[PDB]
Structure formats: C-alpha cells, structure tokens
Amino acid sequence: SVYDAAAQLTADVKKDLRDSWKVIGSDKKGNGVALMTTLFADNQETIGYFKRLGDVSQGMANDKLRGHSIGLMYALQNFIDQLDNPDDLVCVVEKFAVNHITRKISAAEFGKINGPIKKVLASKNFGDKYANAWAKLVAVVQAAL
Amino acid sequence: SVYDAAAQLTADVKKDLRDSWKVIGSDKKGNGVALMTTLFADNQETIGYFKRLGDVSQGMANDKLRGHSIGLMYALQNFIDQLDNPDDLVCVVEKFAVNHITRKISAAEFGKINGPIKKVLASKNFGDKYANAWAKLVAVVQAAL
Ligand code: HEM
Numbered sequence: 584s585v586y587d588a589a590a591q592l593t594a595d596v597k598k599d600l601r602d603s604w605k606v607i608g609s610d611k612k613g614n615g616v617a618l619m620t621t622l623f624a625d626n627q628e629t630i631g632y633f634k635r636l637g638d639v640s641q642g643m644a645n646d647k648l649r650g651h652s653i654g655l656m657y658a659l660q661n662f663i664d665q666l667d668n669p670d671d672l673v674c675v676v677e678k679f680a681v682n683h684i685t686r687k688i689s690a691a692e693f694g695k696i697n698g699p700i701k702k703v704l705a706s707k708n709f710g711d712k713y714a715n716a717w718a719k720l721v722a723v724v725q726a727a728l
Numbered sequence: 729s730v731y732d733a734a735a736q737l738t739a740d741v742k743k744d745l746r747d748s749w750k751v752i753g754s755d756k757k758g759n760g761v762a763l764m765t766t767l768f769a770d771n772q773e774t775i776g777y778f779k780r781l782g783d784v785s786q787g788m789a790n791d792k793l794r795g796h797s798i799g800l801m802y803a804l805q806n807f808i809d810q811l812d813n814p815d816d817l818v819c820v821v822e823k824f825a826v827n828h829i830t831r832k833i834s835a836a837e838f839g840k841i842n843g844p845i846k847k848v849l850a851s852k853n854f855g856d857k858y859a860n861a862w863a864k865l866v867a868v869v870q871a872a873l
Pocket residue numbers: 629632633635636651654655656658659679682683686688692693694695696823826827
C-alpha cells in the first residue's frame with residue numbers, strides 16, 4: 584500500500600522535493616513554526632490534538648510549540664534523505680505513522696497539512712510545481728494511516 | 729534539572745560532539761542499527777520495551793527495527809544541531825522526553841545507551857574522550873525523564 588504510493592515519487596518529483604528542501608530545511612525552527620502556526624490559523628479544529636502544547640497563540644515564544652515544530656522538520660529531513668531507496672523510505676514512513684495512528688489521526692486529517700506546506704513554499708517563492716511534489720510525499724504518509 | 733544539565737555542555741564538549749558526529753552521522757542506517765543491536769546484546773532486559781519491533785535478532789533485515797534505528801539517528805542529529813542555542817536544545821529535549829516518559833523509561837534505563845554509544849564510537853577510532861562527551865549529552869535527556 585505504502586510502496587504503491589511511493590511509486591508516485593518519480594525522478595522529477597524527487598528532484599523538486601530535494602531542491603525545495605534545500606531552502607525550506609535551512610531554517611527548521613523558523614519554517615517549522617511557520618508550518619504549525621499556519622495549520623492552526625487555517626484549520627483551527629486541529630488545535631484539539633495539541634492541548635499539551637498549551638497556549639499555541641504564542642507561536643515561536645511557546646517553548647513546547649517550538650520544540651514540536653523543530654522536531655517535525657527532522658521527520659521531513661528523514662523522508663527526504665530516504666527518497667532514493669524505496670525500501671528505507673517505506674520502513675521510515677511506517678515507523679512514523681505508528682504514533683499518529685495511536686492518536687487517531689486519519690489520512691484526511693493529516694492531509695490538512697498540505698495547505699500550510701503550499702503557503703510556506705510560496706513564501707520562499709516555490710510555486711504550484713513544488714506544492715504538488717510535496718502533496719505526493721504527504722500522500723505516501725497518508726497511505727500508512 | 730534539564731536547564732542545569734544543558735549548562736554542562738562546555739565549549740570543548742560541544743566540539744567533541746560535533747567532530748565525532750561528523751563521522752557517526754555519516755551512516756545513519758548502519759550506525760543506528762549497530763547502536764540498537766549492541767543495546768539488545770549487552771542489555772537483553774531492554775528488549776521487552778520493543779515488543780512491537782518483532783524479532784530484533786534479524787538486525788538490518790527487520791524492517792521495523794531498521795525504521796526505528798534510522799529515526800533514532802535523526803533525533804541525535806536534532807540535538808547536535810541545537811548545541812548553539814541552549815533554549816532550543818532544552819525545548820527539543822523535553823519534547824523528545826514526552827513519549828519516553830509515557831513508556832516509563834527511567835533515567836537509569838535510558839542511560840544504558842551509553843555503553844552502545846561508547847562501543848560504536850570506538851569502532852570508528854573515537855576513544856573515551858568522545859564517549860564521555862556523549863555521556864554528557866545523554867545526561868541532558870536523563871534530567872528530563
Ligand atoms: C508533515 C506533517 C507532519 C510531520 C512531519 C509530523 C511530525 C511529527 C513528529 C516528528 C512528532 C514527534 C514524534 C511523535 O510523537 O510521533 C509528531 C507529534 C505529533 N503529531 Fe505529527 N507531524 C505532522 C503532521 C501532523 C498533523 C497534521 C497532526 C494533527 C492534525 C499531527 C499531530 C501530532 C501530535 C498531536 C503530536 C504530539 C504533539 C505533542 O504533544 O508534543 N501531526 N508529529
């Protein structure tokens with residue numbers, strides 16, 4: 584199932600992912616927080632899963648939120664680094680899904696991250712071409728949920 | 729406390745951590761799996777916490793173990809990247825501790841990773857000086873458990 588989704592990560596898709604990550608991943612704290620705050624702004628209902636983080640309206644200043652945001656970027660770093668070996672990408676994606684499945688986060692709910700990713704990419708001037716590439720990577724994770 | 733433990737990461741400790749990570753982090757899959765297999769070999773009592781992984785003796789051939797091992801190396805990558813800013817190191821360490829606290833992994837239990845780290849370091853020509861530097865980093869996590 585996840586292997587089939589990984590099959591959509593073509594040579595061109597993997598190239599656009601690496602190129603955009605070279606920029607987005609160069610400031611994990613800044614862009615990681617940008618992603619989370621954008622998710623909360625566009626889909627307020629998702630805050631329900633983050634009660635432990637406390638006052639998420641504090642953004643970057645919220646230590647728990649900042650810690651979570653930085654960590655999120657290392658998961659993506661992991662995914663990007665495994666792009667050339669489907670076997671490793673799949674095992675890393677399935678490992679990642681375990682805790683999210685436990686939290687009862689459906690593929691549909693997880694998909695809400697696509698909007699924020701598109702916006703963050705656009706802030707760095709990476710157009711629709713790149714957003715579509717990232718939507719395909721997210722789809723690999725969705726296949727595991 | 730975690731804040732006092734992070735203060736123990738002196739100038740040369742941070743430098744030795746970076747110099748050794750430059751080599752160890754070069755092969756996250758290989759060194760990550762070596763780290764886990766060594767832990768299970770030297771402390772068989774910890775295997776119980778990893779029931780979900782299945783037959784851990786299969787090593788690299790165990791997809792779940794490989795997935796977990798690779799991810800473990802990105803957590804260390806995260807810690808190393810935060811050495812410049814104590815405030816960020818602390819929030820990332822506390823974030824990391826959440827799930828380990830939930831699994832009831834105590835500071836003493838976590839500290840068992842020091843042996844495996846020392847052995848992997850030694851396999852790459854990094855002696856006691858480096859093993860002790862890493863013990864200091866591990867001590868920051870222990871303070872959060
Ligand atoms: C690109 C997308 C995402 C990435 C890379 C990501 C990454 C991570 C990572 C690395 C962790 C820490 C390890 C763990 O506990 O599993 C985590 C925790 C978590 N994730 Fe995901 N995640 C993503 C999207 C989401 C979404 C869309 C939701 C919910 C709508 C979600 C909810 C959670 C929650 C509730 C936690 C625990 C937060 C805490 O209490 O500290 N994640 N995620």
